[PDB]
Structure formats: C-alpha cells, structure tokens
C-alpha cells in the first residue's frame, strides 16, 4: 500500500526546549548556548514519507512509530532504526536495504538496546557521536496544545560515532530543525525548566537576555550592536601587464637543437597560467614538479621556459629522475620541480613521410649530463681504441639528426616539447597571476569591500590630491581612509561600514511588551 497524506507549514511557538545538560539548578536563570528550535519558527506539518535531511537535529513532534536515522537509505551505511512497539521501546541498528517504504513487518551491523491522541515530542540530536534523544510524551488536550511550555528531558546517549544525514517516520510528524541559538532558561526551585527566552528573537527578548531576567523595568537598555555587509570588490593592482613568453613556447614553430635547450628567462609578467589549462590533449600534462594546479596562482620569478625538439624515446627520459637514453647523454632533469614540462608528439610538424633527418641530437655524447644544465656544449664522445681525440675511428658524432619517421612508434615520432623551471629564492619574483577587475569599483553602497590593500568598509570616490606617486592615505592615526584605483586614477576615500549600539526603550514588561529601538 501507499497510504500517504498532506503537508502544511506551522509556527513553531514557544516550545522545543530540552534540558541541555544533566546538571541540577534551582531558582537560577541559566544562559545556555546549545542547539535549540528557535522560537516562533516554521515547522512542516506533514500528514506521507519524505526523505527529510538532518540539519543538526529535529524537534520531531507527533500525534498518532519509528524512524530510520541513517545517511543513505539502504543496506550500506548502518542506518539506525528506532521503534516504539509496546513490547519494548527498542532499536534496530542495522542496514536492511530499502525497507519497502515502511514496516518490514538486516546486515552485519551493530549492537542493540532496549528499554492522533497526544504529543510524543522528540528532539533527536546527534553531536560528534552520541545521537541523543531528549523527549517528553505530553498527553496534550487534543489539538489545543501545539504550544505551551514543556521541556524535553534526555532519554539516552547511545555513543555512536556514525554520521547521520536523513530520516523519516513509519506508521503528527512536525519536523523542525535545530539551530545554534542562545536561550535563557528559568529553573524553578524544584529544578524544572519553567520558561525560556530566545535571545535573538526580537528586541525585548534580547533585552531580557542581557539583563538575565524575565522582567525588565522601564528604561533604555544597550543590548547589543549592529553591522555586517558582504559584497566582494577586488579591483586589483595591475591593468594590462604583459603576459609572458607563454603561448610562445606552447605555440612556437621552430624549437632549438636538443642540447641547446632554449631556456629563456620568461618575462616580467602577467603569467597568469590558465592559458595552460585550456589546451587540447597534451599527452604530457603531468606536472613534473608541484601539482599541475597553482602555477597561475603562485608567483615565482621566472620558470625559464625551455624549448627543444625530441622524438618519443628521448621524450620518455624528459622527467625528474627518469634518467634514460637522452637524459643519459643529452637532456637531463633534476630531482623535481622541472616547472610543468608539457610534451606532445609533433608528427605532422617535424617529420614528413620522407622520414625527416633534420634536428640534431647527441647520443654517445660522452655520458649523462648533470641534472638541468644548458648543453650548447656538445662535447664529443670518448670512444677509445685511439689516444688522439678520444673518438674511436674518427668523429664520433654527438650530432644525431633525430632521424625519425611518421611510420615509427611515437617513441620515434617527431616531438616538439616545452619545458619549465621556476626560480624563487632571490630578489622578489617577477612572474605571477593575480585576479583583476571585480567590478565597477562600486562607489557608494557599503560594498566596495576591498581595494588592492585589503579594506572592509563603505568604499566610494573622494576629492583628495594624491601627489601622483602616493597611492593610499592614512589619517592622523594609521587608518587608511583613502585609496586610488589601481587600474584607473580614482582617488577613492574609504569610510567604515557603520555601527552603533542598538538600545531598546521599554515601558517595562509590567506595563506592556512593546519596545522602541
């Protein structure tokens, strides 16, 4: 069957408050900070099985059995399964893939435990384990009391390190969601919570909650203060700074002879790398060094972009560690941090099916060259059987026209390859990738909530005359109340957001309960 029913939306009145701790107190007015059901909030009067996320707790009333208190709805996740069935108010702590919707009437799960007429109230609350089940079954007078003050004495801790996110009933049903709100509970002398005051409900309540009392006399009380405002304006120092030699090695026509690794010192900058990420399949994007991210963001001086051609069997050796035939005679790379070397085959681009014999490399140069040099030095090979020039017969070429073919392996396909190697120790970096141009600097509307230097305030235009090298301006005491737009001229003087002290004017809760603010 599917016996479902309707929904609603009701005003969760002054109720949903539970003894937050096992501590007795008498004739006090405590001021807690627990998670409660804020006063006069909205409860969703279900009449009909929903999936109901677990936003930190539930003031779960009812009027007419059990609940599934897991995160996923299946045989996976150890979904806790309560039940109150007049034999024992006991549990089920197993998985049990998708009980049909309700009422099965079991997996390798867990332990177990045992123990429309009225108001079986329930504030289930899970906090880093210990899914706690404060409750009170109030035999209400029918429909007349969906409000009236009642506290929810705990029932059990159940230390369960499990992460709940969902739940639902099976065989009323006002799900309300707990939030972090400070209350002012009023214990009588017997020890019971007879009242409460949601401190952030309204001005009057907030006043009671700073006077720590339930009745305030006439007067004007300074309760709290007031201001926040978000809107991010992050107008940035640069305007049109030169990019980089990037998109010049990634997109060059003729690279260097392989041992003459065309390292440059990549130029001043806006080397805001993202033009990196866009490219079509690289077949070598694996950042040989730090993660293939963060290069746009990090600011190193130069990454010394090298430029050379290879063919795949040599390209295999182009990596930190990974010493091999060409990083065993010609082109070696250090322990790490070879920038983000980006190899790719250049079939159509460096060899024709004539089997191009163009670009000279050095196998049998002498031996492996030491990590990351520039090898315009193409020292000839010690080949023995002769003292004169070392070279064995005569002229042992470390000049190997790469001698490949588009019909080989890509180990022997043409390969044009870009290399990087960043510098960051000495006099401050040149290359980096800040953002820019949030917006239209956002003169008034206390929004223009940064500028270059981080500021948070009303930030608009001014009428100062900043001596055209001076950029921001202090007041007599070291608070910058002026700034110039970086990308434009715009002498903007800044001013702080706003604030004060909300003071609450009341005739005294004996006369009335209206307040002026």
């Amino acid at each position, epitope marked *: 069957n599917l016996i479902t029913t309707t929904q609603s939306y009701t005003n969760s009145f002054t109720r949903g408050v539970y003894y937050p701790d096992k501590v007795f107190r008498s004739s006090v007015l405590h001021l807690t900070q627990d998670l409660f059901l804020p006063f006069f909030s909205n409860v969703t009067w279900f009449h009909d099985n929903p999936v109901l996320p677990f936003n930190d707790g539930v003031y779960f009333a009812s009027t007419e059995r059990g609940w599934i208190f897991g995160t996923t709805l299946d045989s996976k996740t150890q979904s806790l399964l309560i039940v109150n069935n007049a034999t024992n108010v006991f549990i089920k702590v197993c998985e049990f893939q998708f009980c049909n919707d309700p009422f099965l009437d079991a997996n390798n799960c867990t332990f177990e435990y045992v123990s429309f007429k009225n108001l079986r109230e329930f504030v289930f609350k899970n906090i880093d384990g210990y899914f706690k089940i404060y409750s009170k079954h109030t035999p209400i007078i029918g429909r007349d009391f969906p409000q009236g003050f009642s506290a929810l004495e705990p029932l059990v801790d159940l230390p369960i390190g499990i992460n709940i996110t969902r739940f639902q009933t099976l065989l009323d049903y006002y799900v309300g969601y707990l939030q972090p709100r400070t209350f002012l509970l009023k214990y009588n002398e017997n020890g019971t919570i007879t009242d409460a005051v949601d401190c952030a409900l309204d001005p009057l309540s907030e006043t009671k909650c700073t006077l720590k009392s339930f009745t305030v006399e006439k007067g004007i009380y300074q309760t709290s203060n007031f201001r926040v405002q978000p809107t991010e304006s992050i107008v940035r120092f640069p305007n*049109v700074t*030169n990019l980089c030699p990037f998109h*010049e090695v990634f997109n060059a*026509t003729r690279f260097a002879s392989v041992y003459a690794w065309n390292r440059t010192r990549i130029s001043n900058c806006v080397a805001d790398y993202s033009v990196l990420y866009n490219f079509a399949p690289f077949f070598a994007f694996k950042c040989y060094g730090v993660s293939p991210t963060k290069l746009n963001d990090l600011c190193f001086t130069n990454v010394y972009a090298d430029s050379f051609v290879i063919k795949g069997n040599e390209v295999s050796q182009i990596a930190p560690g990974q010493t091999g035939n060409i990083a065993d005679y010609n082109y070696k790379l250090p322990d790490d941090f070879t920038g983000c070397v980006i190899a790719w085959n250049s079939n159509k681009l460096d060899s024709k099916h004539s089997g191009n014999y163009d670009y000279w490399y050095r196998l049998f140069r002498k031996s492996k060259l030491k990590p990351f040099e520039r090898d315009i030095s193409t020292e000839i090979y010690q080949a023995g059987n002769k003292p004169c020039k070392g070279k064995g017969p005569n002229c042992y070429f470390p000049l190997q026209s790469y001698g490949f073919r588009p019909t080989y392996g890509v180990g022997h396909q043409p390969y044009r390859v870009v290399v990087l190697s960043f510098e960051l120790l000495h006099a401050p970096a040149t290359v980096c990738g800040p953002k820019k141009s949030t917006n239209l600097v956002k003169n008034k509307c206390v929004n223009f909530n940064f500028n270059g230097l981080t500021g948070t305030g009303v930030l608009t235009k001014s009428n100062k005359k900043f001596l055209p090298f001076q950029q921001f301006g202090r007041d007599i005491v070291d608070t910058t109340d002026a700034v110039r737009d970086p990308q434009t001229l715009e002498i903007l003087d800044i001013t702080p957001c706003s604030f004060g002290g909300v003071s609450v004017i009341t005739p005294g809760t004996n006369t009335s309960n209206q307040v002026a603010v």
Partner: antibody, heavy 126, light 106 residues
Framework: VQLVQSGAEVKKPGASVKVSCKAS????????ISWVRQAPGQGLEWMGW????????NYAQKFQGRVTMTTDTSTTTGYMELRRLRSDDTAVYYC????????????????????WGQGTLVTVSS | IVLTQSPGTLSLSPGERATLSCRAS???????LAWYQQKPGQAPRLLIY???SRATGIPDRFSGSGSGTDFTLTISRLEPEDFAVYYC????????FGGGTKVEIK
C-alpha cells in the same frame, strides 16, 4: 580583433603617413602587429611588423627608410609610417598580428599573420 | 621562396569538387605554410593554417591539400561562402602571400 584602421587616407607625393591601427580588445603588450601592402592587384606586399611588446621591426627593404613602423602604445593605435607617398604609391595596406615571428624576440613562431587590420585605403591620388 | 596560386580564375560552379593550385616553390613543410581568405576586397581571414587544415570557421565544403611546390587546394563542393578571395601564405622564409586563385561563377 577589430584593429580599427584609418580609411581613404589623403597623403601627397612628398608626404609621410601615420596609418591608424587601434590595437583592439586583446592584451596589446603580448603580441606583435605585422603589416602587408595590398597594392591593387598585387596581392599583398610584405610591409613589416611591430612588436607590440618592444617594437622590434622587420621592415621592407622596398620601404627601408620609407616604412618606419611606430605605435601609440598608450592608446594602442598602430602607426605604420611610410614616407615616399605618391599616386603610384597610393596603395592600401593592412595590419596583422605577427604570430609567424612571435613577438618579444623577433623570432619565427607557430601561427600565421594573426588577426588583421580594418584597412588603410591610402588615397594619395594625384 | 615563392608561391603561385595557379587557377587565378578557377571557374567551377557550386556543388562540384575542384582543384586550386597555390603551388609553392620549395618543399616547405605546411607547419609554416598556410591559407588566408579575404572577402573580395577585405582583410584576410585565418583560412587554412597548416595549409590543408580546417579550423573552426571553415566549413566542410572548403577542401584542399598539397606539399612541396605543387600545393593543390582540391576544393570540394562549392558555395558563395567559398567565393571569397583565398591567399595561400608561407610562414616559412619571409612571408610572400598569394595573389590569385579565386573560385568564380557562370
């Protein structure tokens, strides 16, 4: 991308030209603007190229002292300047972002003469 | 090194595979050599970088191939779209443009 150019430029037999080329909505500094001279019917005569970064220029021997490519880097408007104007010299040119010689180096790079000037239809009619 | 758009007046009606020789002089690898379309009286478009290769803007109807010194832009079924002026470039060796071979009509 628009590379806003001049138009029916009225020069004279014995004047010098300041052709306009508004370096359009691209980061002007990170490129180089080449030029070709579309002599009427004569395809395009290789004019030269400005490095919008530094101003490295590969002029045309034809226009060795004649073409002297300059630019208003501030208002990003390219000025490929040719003295020796005349009726026989009244021929239209264009801009082109030189990605053949990728800029910053005056060195051949991948890509062609990139996005182009509007057109400087130099009317030096006599 | 020079380029030669041979069929300066290639007259093939739309809907028919044609052949347009821009006919270089060297054995230039198209890694440099390219094609640039201009409206018949406007600035050249990036037509065919790679000199045989189709980019974003180019439809399928545009066809062409070639290597060495006999670059034959073997154009496919034609359109007025393909009736602009196409100038085969040479990024190699001091770029000499093309001047010739449009595709014409009745």
């Amino acid at each position: 991308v628009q590379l806003v150019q001049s138009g029916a430029e009225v020069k004279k037999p014995g004047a010098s030209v300041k052709v306009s080329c508004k370096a359009s909505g691209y980061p002007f500094t990170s490129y180089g603007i080449s030029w070709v001279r579309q002599a009427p019917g004569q395809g395009l005569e290789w004019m030269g190229w400005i490095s919008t970064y530094n101003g490295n220029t590969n002029y045309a021997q034809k226009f060795q002292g004649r073409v002297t490519m300059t630019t208003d880097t501030s208002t990003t408007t390219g000025y490929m300047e040719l003295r020796r104007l005349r009726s026989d010299d009244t021929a239209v040119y264009y801009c082109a972002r030189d990605y053949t010689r990728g800029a910053w180096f005056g060195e051949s790079l991948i890509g062609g003469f990139d996005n182009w000037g509007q057109g400087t239809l130099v009317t030096v009619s006599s | 090194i020079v380029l030669t758009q041979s069929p300066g007046t290639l007259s093939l009606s739309p809907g028919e595979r044609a052949t347009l020789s821009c006919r270089a002089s060297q054995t230039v690898s198209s890694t440099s050599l390219a094609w640039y379309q201009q409206k018949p009286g406007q600035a050249p478009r990036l037509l065919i970088y790679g000199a045989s290769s189709r980019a974003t803007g180019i439809p399928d109807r545009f066809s062409g191939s070639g290597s060495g010194t006999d670059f034959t832009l073997t154009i496919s079924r034609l359109e007025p779209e393909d009736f602009a002026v196409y100038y085969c470039q040479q990024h190699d060796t001091s770029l000499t443009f093309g001047g010739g071979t449009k595709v014409e009509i009745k």
